[PDB]
Amino acid sequence: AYSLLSSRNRLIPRVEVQCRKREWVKTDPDSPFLNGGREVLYTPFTAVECTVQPMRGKAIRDQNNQLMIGGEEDYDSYTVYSETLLFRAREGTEHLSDQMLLPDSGGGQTWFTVMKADMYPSSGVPRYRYYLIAVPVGTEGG
Amino acid sequence: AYSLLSSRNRLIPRVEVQCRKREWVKTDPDSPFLNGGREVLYTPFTAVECTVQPMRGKAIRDQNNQLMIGGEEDYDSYTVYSETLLFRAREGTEHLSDQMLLPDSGGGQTWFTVMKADMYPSSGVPRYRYYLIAVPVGTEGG
Amino acid sequence: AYSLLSSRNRLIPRVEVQCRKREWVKTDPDSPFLNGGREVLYTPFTAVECTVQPMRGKAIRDQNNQLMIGGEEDYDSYTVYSETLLFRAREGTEHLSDQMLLPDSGGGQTWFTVMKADMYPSSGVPRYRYYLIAVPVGTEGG
Amino acid sequence: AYSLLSSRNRLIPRVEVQCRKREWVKTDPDSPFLNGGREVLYTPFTAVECTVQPMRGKAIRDQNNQLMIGGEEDYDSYTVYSETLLFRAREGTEHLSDQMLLPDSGGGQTWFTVMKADMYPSSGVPRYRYYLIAVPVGTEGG
Amino acid sequence: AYSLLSSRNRLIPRVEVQCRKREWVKTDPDSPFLNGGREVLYTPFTAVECTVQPMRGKAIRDQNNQLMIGGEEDYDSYTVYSETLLFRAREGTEHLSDQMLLPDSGGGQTWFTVMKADMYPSSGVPRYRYYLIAVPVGTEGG
Amino acid sequence: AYSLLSSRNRLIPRVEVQCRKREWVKTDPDSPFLNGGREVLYTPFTAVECTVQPMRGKAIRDQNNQLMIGGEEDYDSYTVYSETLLFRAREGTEHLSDQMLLPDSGGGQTWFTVMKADMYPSSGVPRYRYYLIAVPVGTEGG
Amino acid sequence: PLDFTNSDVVMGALTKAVGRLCLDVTGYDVVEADETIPKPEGPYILVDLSLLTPLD
Prior knowledge:
This is part of a larger assembly, with 6 copies of chain A and 1 copy of chain G.
Chain A: E1 15-22, E2 42-53, E3 65-67, E4 72-74, E5 77-82, E6 99-103, E7 109-118, E8 128-134
Antiparallel strand pairs in A: 1-2, 1-6, 2-5, 3-4, 5-8, 6-7, 7-8
Chain G: H1 7-26, E1 29-32, E2 44-47
Parallel strand pairs in G: 1-2
Protein name (chain G): Phage neck terminator protein gp12-like domain-containing protein
Pfam families (chains A, B, C, D, E, F): Phage_HCP
InterPro entries (chains A, B, C, D, E, F): Phage_SPP1_head-tail_adaptor
């Protein structure tokens, strides 16, 4: 079985990041809809150690500021290697995708939503790879 | 003839997985259709030793949770190397494609349906490669 | 001139395969058409030594079982290296493309029709590469 | 932690470049619009050390002079490695994207607008990569 | 200046091929058209030494026999390295593209028409590369 | 700073090529248009040392003779490395793109128009790369 | 006690009526779009309820 990869690295620096779980709930008392007035509940936590890297190409959809008919919108993304388990959304449930807070190109800090998670069930070592997309500015995603 | 590849590996860990065969049957007594009320019959079994790996890219159709007009749907896939023979569906018959149970990105376990099987008839060694797609959530595939 | 490649290999195993030539004929006595009731005439033979390999990618058109509006159709293909000369169809003639029998993903055996043949006239050594596509299930091709 | 990359290179020559920050302001007293008569305010500065390189391919959109129905328009771009932090535009604010002055294919000098900025928050060393597009001739961008 | 490449190879076998130049002429006495009844004039010759190789991929347009609504048409192509100069067609003239006779996938021999010629004027050594496409069966090209 | 690349090569042969600058002028006395009867003024010169190479692929738009509804048109292109500075067109001016005379696939000589110029302002050494397209036969470009 | 045949009954029985008449005339085999199965052998017909229009 794997031995070296089953232990923490000692050459490349790694950092911890903050995250938060997400659910949703219905608030309207009389509306007949599952949506109602949707609300999201958060529960914070942290990842043991992570590595953050940017997109490699220069494709038009990967550029940071984009020109739309309204104005120069904003976009960011990352690829993350981590030893913590993060989950995407699951259907027929009230759980949403986990989010984690990282620096952006504008100098601030914003939340990124997990979109793709990679796992190797037959190997055993707990090492994962994630792909993240920054939440739209002015909202908390979906 | 091949010798080394005709024996089980001794460096990379391998695991066994569970599977199940699938047929179908007509139930309606009076309906004139081959479909009738379709039913599927299962017969479980296991694969001797297997290796599971995820998709390598980040293409929009390979992401786990996808945004549709209804809601954040779910999608998963894998590539598997195995020494057991698994079969796809064959036309003009009552046999369907084999399925096997593997972990998913949401933390649960779900059935994957064999879609592509690779064989090397002229070599002799029984080593195969499969490509699998997770069954739609809430159903048993087709 | 080439010497080593002008002799049979002694490390990689090779196998022989069966083939069959194909012509066509008109049967209707009074129909004014070249087609008439078409018939195909076969003459079997074998290839001296061959190597069979599957398609390398996972493109949607290379998957084995495909979902159509009628039902889960079937598809297979291969790449073959051989030291026998096989011919494609030629226009203005009554000769059709050669076919050869190989194992498929469903566990059976079916006929594959030669579609592309590669030759190196300036080199001299008789080594060829072919690309084959499985005949539609329930028919004998065209 | 990284040591060698946390210091300035001593083999490849590097140069400093000039830049300028950009805001915007409304001037019309009575117009009800956020736009009004837009104006941009500049504040110059310089980058510590930079490396400039051109696009690698020959794709039709990367050529310098382009044929349009009006006349042979002009286009240029670059990829820059730098140890200074430059920012893109941020929404809901009055800040615009930074610009920096570089030589062009016509022998002159023109302003390039930052479009994509790459950062590695988990590594620590302050090394960045930018992608720039030349401002349209006869205007100051947007 | 180049020395080794300015001499004939002594390891890889090379062969000579036959070719033929092509012009055209107007025959109709009274037709007012440049076309008239077009005719082509030939003058044979040979290439000093050449190497023939087939297309590397398996793209649908590179397959030999193609299925059209009429019938299984025919197609072939090659890449040739040669030390003889061959010319394409030139406009405003009566010269057409040179052709050369090579073996095909159907076992016969047919004429290939030069479509792309590569030269290195600044190097000096007379080594060229050509790309050829087989003439449509039953005609002499255009 | 760069030393070796700041001097002329001594292994690969290089050649000089001829060029010519291009302006334009209005001739009509009464026409109200900037175009008028356009004319181009030339001033010849030469490049110190250059290397010429052809396109690497076989894409349909890179072939030499092309079949159009009128007749077998002509097309050529190159990639050139040079130590002379050549300029493209600049807008709001009367300067056009430089041209240089090179051999073609038809055995003649024709003018190529500079379309893309690559420079490395931060390195210092005067080495450039150009991409050229042959002028349409029977005209002097635009 | 005054019962009837609601929409669900009529709609489902119309498909089977079409299915039997196709089988009994042409001699081919029949299949619907509701559930997917591997393609049968021999000639066959596929039935689908593409569209439905109300009257106000």
